[PDB]
Amino acid sequence: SMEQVAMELRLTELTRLLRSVLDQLQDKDPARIFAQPVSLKEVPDYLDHIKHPMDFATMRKRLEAQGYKNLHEFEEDFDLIIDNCMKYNARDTVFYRAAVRLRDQGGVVLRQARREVDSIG
Numbered sequence: 284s285m286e287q288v289a290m291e292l293r294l295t296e297l298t299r300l301l302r303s304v305l306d307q308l309q310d311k312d313p314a315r316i317f318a319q320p321v322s323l324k325e326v327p328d329y330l331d332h333i334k335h336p337m338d339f340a341t342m343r344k345r346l347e348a349q350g351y352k353n354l355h356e357f358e359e360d361f362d363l364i365i366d367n368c369m370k371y372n373a374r375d376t377v378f379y380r381a382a383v384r385l386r387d388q389g390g391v392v393l394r395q396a397r398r399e400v401d402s403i404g
């Protein structure tokens with residue numbers, strides 16, 4: 284139907300906007316601490332601690348599959364990256380501190396993205 288095509292066009296455009304957001308957010312992790320999933324070969328007990336792991340590569344996979352239906356779904360995955368890190372790692376670690384910085388610097392990018400998504404429809 285024409286309606287389904289129009290809907291798919293909107294999804295494609297959302298994916299394009301979210302791709303830009305994702306690149307901007309990942310730029311705020313220059314150490315690439317959150318770039319890949321935590322390896323069970325390196326951290327064997329990780330899944331005993333964290334029930335819903337997330338990372339930028341996994342987000343990018345879901346993104347390119349047009350698996351984010353709205354910004355809220357995207358933000359919930361971004362939030363997992365930060366919240367998981369701030370649970371698993373203690374406050375005086377380079378990991379926790381990177382998560383704080385990513386949260387702070389990313390809020391700016393997400394504040395604008397929320398307005399843009401509301402604007403464009």
Ligand SMILES: CC(=O)NCCNc1ccccc1
Nearest residue numbers: 316317321325326368371378
């Ligand atoms: C994203 C995150 O929580 N990173 C810290 C915990 N994972 C870790 C993996 C290899 C070596 C040291 C630590």
